[PDB]
Design a protein around this ligand. Structure first.
Ligand SMILES: Nc1ncnc2c1ncn2[C@@H]1O[C@H](COP(=O)(O)OP(=O)(O)OP(=O)(O)O)[C@@H](O)[C@H]1O
Ligand SMILES: Nc1ncnc2c1ncn2[C@@H]1O[C@H](COP(=O)(O)OP(=O)(O)O)[C@@H](O)[C@H]1O
Ligand SMILES: Nc1ncnc2c1ncn2[C@@H]1O[C@H](COP(=O)(O)O)[C@@H](O)[C@H]1O
Ligand SMILES: OC[C@H]1O[C@H](O[C@H]2[C@H](O)[C@@H](O)[C@@H](O)O[C@@H]2CO)[C@H](O)[C@@H](O)[C@@H]1O
Lengths: 87, 407, 367, 300
């Protein structure tokens, strides 16, 4: 229930001096940079936290292609989907 | 008041929203606790959904150490919630009356409590305010968790903005207005309760309110000779000011002190997967004395022949500047948006091949005074079985954005 | 800068606007009039905080619980004004020795009967199920009123010797609970025997009875001075006669008073509450009665001599003589909601008659 | 025989087969080959569902068989010809590859039974069977033979164990015993690759002068060429290519014809390999068994 003044054009700046939100340290904990166990499987991953799932974890673009991943939930199953898509 | 068979007794307390009393059955004399939410007083505020997200939740919950909602009855006078009533009263009056407790008792209770708050966390609810004055005891002197007015619902990929609760027992992160996950603030209030259950005194106490926040934000606290070092360790690691280094329900489960004298009726196809499929946590002791390991056959050339995943897009500039750039490029891409907050967007596209629509949310963050982060969050579709991939449509929308935003 | 006045849905906004036009022209400010549904719950939400509307139109009785809260405004009587304007109405609005409300209209319930069909109206409640037994051969019905509001249903329950409260003197016993007595048992049992014997439909609310009466589908309902303005659009030739007695003992209709209570505002003058309103009452009240609706029971003898020529007014009078004035105490509010729940639980089958009466006594004792 | 296994595979669905937390990748058709290939070693996964951006469907799969095919088919010399296949694309090799035959992408809902999954496996001779939910359209996991056989052997208990344990491997006649494709330890990789692409074989156990299996050459081993940047030279023998792990491997995993099928499947799920080369006291190689053959026997 928040009012917003103008949409097509920007009439004036916000009255509040500062409104930045600070990043919580739970999205800085990435699960792909975690080094899994040698003996189990390269395919598997340790169990992530329910919060950090829907957010997008982009790998740094190196050679003219994008490299992004996300952890999607299911009923009792988590999956991490990686896509490499050229520009 | 009387609805079916109960004549109210003595007023228990003032409660959060309205007062609470004790019913008494007219023929057998059963004692229930009835929560009276005055209609006028809650319709004044906007909290009418915040009660709903309690009523929805407490209809499902059944636990022997959690106070069980029986039924909620609504009538134009006021709202009534009927719950089990216990004779022993609140915890803080036993803390008061008994002073400091030994290990067997504090242990047993803390186990019962922790088991409750696990059971809650798993069903995707977090009740912010933990204190002895909100938790009761029965005739058998077990642990009962009563007050759930200040609870909330845990959504998928959604943090919490609202910080409330006791000033002593509020987490270090929430007092500075920071977004936070539900489990660690509960775990930290658990750990200060456990401290209270051993020494008798609060760990972070002061009259002056700014000094109290400074003492909470600092990790130092009193460590007596009253108890063994195992608990000292367990508290230092449980009451860490860093939420990244703060323990979880697992981390406490496999702790030495916790295991001792634990009846197993607290923690309960799933179990088939747990045992045989999983075999198909690194142990510190085994690594030191063993030099031989059996590597999986899919990995065996990689550790003979032998990548930093960023969070998202970071561009150091003014907040309004970058958000204007983004709102200009998403319009250049001919897609359409709405804003709730000036730094929050809910955007959606239409499938070119099918008539379906896909959505997502944008929330701008700050990693530090020099740099910001722009986050990309996916959503769910409630109803229709769509012959297309949510994840891929999401990734392609994000790609088509980031391409125009970089180049 | 704008005066919002919330009004009930049965009331007419145009009549209030006509009365307000004269004041409006002098002031130069225009008044908006809305009719929000369930105005019982919409006023004490904003009244506790002082938000929203300025003036509330509602019955006097549910102000005696608003006053006990401390929300309502305070006025002081004047010696030269109180005596001349009204002989006795002040008694009804005198809470704790201080006036809290402006008495506008002495009102009472009455029987509105068809003349062409059923030429003679009944005078007892004991021949109404026999008049329905006679009329269920022709395809008509005798009495079809709202069974959801207890304002209409009470004078049938309390007529057999069932009394919630005695006011012979100031003294009364809070411990004694009196609605499970014999009279109220026979009156609720007789209304459950009226529903079970298929004489009365147990699904008619205010809306159904109001649409069946505005179209002329029911010959009798106990509504009040509103619906006569809708009978003038209807072909049905009609009369207004005394409510029926019961075993010799007459029915006791409650005496409502439409009042206008100031809602909280950040500036409030003390003189405006009494001195300004008294002048308004003389003109606002007299004109409203003369223009649209004859209330017929006013405390000024000059315009009473003109209104006592209508025999419908003397029927309202002969009702209101045989009745009992309502106590202004706040617990009557906590009585009202009791009685409504007696009449919806016995009618829906959730509870029996004895259980409903026991529940009402427990509600009186335990709320 | 089929009284318990067929019932056990019809009553349980593919959903339960999927592990709890896993890492999966997908590829775009506009991507080049060599990029995705170099990526497949760094990510640790060998298979990926291909997604075409234009068609809005899953056009196919990318496994190490495709790698092998493109390496054999386009190979002229060992140092100066390697230009052409660097710049090659995934959709271009898709378009030229389906000149001979049109094999689309096959998928199964995870709510369907395991029996239908292993039915699709055999009937299309594919090792990599994705599961795609019909509602969400997302590709959860890629089912494999090895998972299904580990889940069959580990789950079974002595009270529901069948009476089929008693029969020995020999007498039952399971596997391919007639035409054993072999290579010598001095032969290069190229010929092994020829044999891979021309036949339907999944690996070759290499033999010495006598014919004793000293090592094996798998279709999965070839990615170490793309890992150590030794895919340029195919002239070297398979001993040079397997020299990297000569300090690491324990020995050749092998069984006999006189052992029981119980112990064979238990040493197969305990070594986590694709086959057990059956030998004799001589160590001459009579016949080769496969995981697919065992699954085919189990289903019927
Ligand atoms: N009979 C065998 N003797 C010796 N080594 C073997 C034998 N079978 C397999 N190996 C070794 O095991 C490793 C993996 O073989 P396998 O083909 O089972 O793995 P994979 O292809 O990753 O599994 P999957 O078939 O499930 O994809 C190979 O590098 C190979 O050297
Ligand atoms: N699901 C599938 N649908 C259609 N073709 C496939 C599928 N999976 C693999 N293929 C094709 O079959 C060939 C062999 O694949 P597969 O047997 O699954 O892997 P591998 O040969 O590595 O065990 C590959 O070249 C691939 O192009
Ligand atoms: N190295 C091999 N030599 C002979 N036949 C094989 C070989 N590998 C696999 N096969 C056969 O090919 C079929 C399926 O192969 P695969 O799915 O790759 O296990 C089986 O029925 C086997 O008989
Ligand atoms: O039925 C309960 C109700 O009765 C009276 O309400 C009357 C009101 O006085 C009239 O102005 C009009 O609105 O009809 C109402 C009944 O529907 C009491 O005044 C009120 O307190 C009580 O709730």
């Amino acid at each position: 229930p928040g009012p917003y003044g103008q949409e097509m054009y920007a009439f004036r700046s916000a009255a509040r001096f500062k409104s930045p939100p600070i990043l919580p340290p739970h999205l800085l904990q990435v699960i792909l940079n975690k080094d899994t166990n040698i003996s189990c499987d390269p395919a598997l991953l340790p169990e992530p936290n329910h919060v950090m799932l829907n957010h997008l974890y982009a790998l740094s673009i190196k050679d003219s292609v994008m490299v992004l991943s996300a952890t999607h939930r299911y009923k009792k199953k988590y999956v991490t989907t990686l896509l490499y898509k050229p520009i | 008041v009387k609805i079916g068979h109960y004549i109210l007794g003595d007023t228990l307390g003032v409660g959060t929203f309205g007062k609470v009393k004790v019913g008494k059955h007219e023929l057998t004399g059963h004692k229930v606790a009835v929560k009276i939410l005055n209609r006028q007083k809650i319709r004044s505020l906007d909290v009418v959904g915040k009660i709903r997200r309690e009523i929805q939740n407490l209809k499902l919950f059944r636990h022997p150490h959690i106070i069980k909602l029986y039924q909620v009855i609504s009538t134009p006078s006021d709202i009534f919630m009927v719950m089990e009533y216990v004779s022993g009263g609140e915890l803080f009056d036993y803390i008061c009356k008994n002073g400091r407790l030994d290990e067997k008792e504090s242990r047993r209770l803390f186990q019962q409590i922790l088991s409750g708050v696990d059971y809650c966390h798993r069903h995707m609810v977090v009740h912010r305010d933990l204190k002895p004055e909100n938790v009761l005891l029965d005739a058998h002197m077990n642990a009962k968790i009563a007050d759930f007015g200040l609870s909330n619902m845990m959504s998928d990929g959604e943090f919490l903005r609202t910080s409330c609760g006791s000033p002593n027992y509020a987490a270090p992160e929430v007092i500075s207005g920071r977004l936070y996950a539900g489990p660690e603030v509960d775990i930290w209030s658990s750990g200060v309760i456990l401290y209270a259950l051993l020494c008798g005194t609060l760990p972070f106490d002061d009259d002056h309110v700014p000094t109290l926040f400074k003492k909470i934000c600092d990790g130092i606290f009193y460590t007596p000779q009253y108890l063994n070092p195992s608990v000292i360790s367990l508290l230092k690691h449980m009451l860490q000011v860093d939420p990244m280094k703060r323990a979880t329900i697992k981390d406490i489960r496999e702790h030495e002190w916790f295991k001792q004298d634990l009846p197993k009726y607290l923690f309960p196809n799933r179990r088939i997967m747990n045992e045989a499929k999983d075999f198909y946590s690194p142990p510190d002791s085994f690594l030191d004395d063993h030099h031989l390991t059996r590597p999986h056959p899919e990995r065996v050339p990689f550790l003979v022949a032998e990548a930093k995943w960023h969070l998202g897009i970071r561009s150091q500039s003014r907040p309004n500047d970058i958000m204007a750039e983004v709102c200009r490029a998403i319009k250049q891409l001919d897609y359409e948006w709405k804003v709730v907050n000036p730094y929050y967007l809910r955007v959606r596209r239409k499938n070119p091949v099918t008539s379906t629509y896909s959505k997502m949310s944008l929330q701008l963050y700050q990693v530090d005074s020099r740099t910001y982060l722009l986050d990309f969050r996916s959503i769910d579709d409630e109803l229709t079985p769509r012959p297309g991939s949510h994840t891929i449509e999401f990734f392609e929308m994000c790609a088509n954005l980031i391409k125009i935003l970089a180049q | 800068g704008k005066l919002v006045i919330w009004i009930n849905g049965d009331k007419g906004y145009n009549g209030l606007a006509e009365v307000g036009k004269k004041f409006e022209k002098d002031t130069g400010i225009k008044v908006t009039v809305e009719h929000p549904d369930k105005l019982e719950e919409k006023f004490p939400q904003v009244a506790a905080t002082g938000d929203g509307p300025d003036i509330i139109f509602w019955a006097h009785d549910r102000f005696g619980g608003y006053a006990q809260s401390g929300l309502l405004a305070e006025i002081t009587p004047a010696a030269a004004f109180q005596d001349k304007l009204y002989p006795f109405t002040w008694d009804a609005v005198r809470y704790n020795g201080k006036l809290i409300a402006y008495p506008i209209a002495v009102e009472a319930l009455s029987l509105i009967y068809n003349k062409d069909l059923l030429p003679n109206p009944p005078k007892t409640w004991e021949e109404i199920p026999a008049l329905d037994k006679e009329l269920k051969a022709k395809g008509k019905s005798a009495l079809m009123f709202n069974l959801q509001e207890p304002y209409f249903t009470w004078p049938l329950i309390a007529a057999d010797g069932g009394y919630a409260f005695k006011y012979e003197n100031g003294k009364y016993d809070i411990k004694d609970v009196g609605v499970d007595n014999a009279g109220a048992k026979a009156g609720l049992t007789f209304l459950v025997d009226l529903i079970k014997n298929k004489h009365m439909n147990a699904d008619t609310d205010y809306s159904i009875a109001e649409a069946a009466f505005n179209k002329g589908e029911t010959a009798m309902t106990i509504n009040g001075p509103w619906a006569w303005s809708n009978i003038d659009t209807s072909a049905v030739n009609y009369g207004v006669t005394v409510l029926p007695t019961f075993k010799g003992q007459p029915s006791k209709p409650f005496v409502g008073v439409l009042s206008a209570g100031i809602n909280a505002a950040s500036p409030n003058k003390e003189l405006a509450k009494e001195f300004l309103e008294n002048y308004l009452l003389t003109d606002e009240g007299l004109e409203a009665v003369n223009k649209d609706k004859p209330l017929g029971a006013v405390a000024l003898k000059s315009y009473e001599e003109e209104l006592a020529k209508d025999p419908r007014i003397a029927a309202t009078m002969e009702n209101a003589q045989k009745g009992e004035i309502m106590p202004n105490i706040p617990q009557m509010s906590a009585f009202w909601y009791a009685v409504r729940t007696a009449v919806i639980n016995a009618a829906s089958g959730r509870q029996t008659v004895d259980e409903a009466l026991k529940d009402a006594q427990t509600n009186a004792a335990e709320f | 025989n089929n009284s318990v296994y067929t019932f056990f595979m019809k009553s349980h669905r593919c959903y339960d087969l999927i592990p709890t937390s896993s890492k999966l990748v997908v590829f775009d058709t506009s991507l080049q080959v060599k990029k995705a290939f170099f990526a497949l070693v760094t990510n640790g996964v060998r298979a990926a569902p291909l997604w075409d951006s234009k068609k809005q469907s899953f056009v196919g799969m990318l496994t190490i068989t495709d790698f092998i095919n493109i390496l054999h088919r386009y190979y002229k010399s060992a140092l100066v010809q390697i230009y052409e296949l660097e710049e090659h694309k995934i959709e271009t090799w898709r378009e030229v590859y389906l000149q001979d035959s049109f094999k689309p992408l096959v998928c199964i809902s995870p709510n369907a039974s395991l029996f239908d999954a292993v039915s699709s496996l055999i009937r299309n001779k594919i090792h990599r069977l994705p599961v795609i939910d019909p509602e969400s359209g997302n590709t959860l996991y890629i089912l494999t033979h090895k998972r299904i056989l580990k889940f069959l052997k580990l789950f079974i208990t002595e009270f529901p164990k069948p009476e089929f344990m008693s029969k020995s491997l020999e007498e039952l006649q399971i596997g391919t015993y007639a035409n054993i494709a072999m290579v010598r330890t001095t032969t290069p990789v190229y010929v092994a690759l020829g044999i891979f692409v021309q036949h339907r074989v999944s690996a070759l156990p290499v033999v010495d002068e006598k014919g004793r299996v000293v090592d094996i050459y798998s279709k999965f081993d070839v990615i170490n060429l793309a890992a150590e940047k030794t895919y340029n030279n195919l002239d070297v023998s398979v001993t040079k290519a397997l020299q990297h792990r000569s300090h690491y491997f324990e020995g050749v995993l092998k069984c006999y014809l006189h052992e029981t099928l119980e112990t064979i499947i238990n040493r197969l799920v305990e070594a986590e390999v694709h086959r057990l080369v059956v030998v004799d006291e001589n160590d001459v190689v009579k016949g080769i068994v496969s995981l697919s053959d065992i699954l085919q026997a189990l289903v019927l």
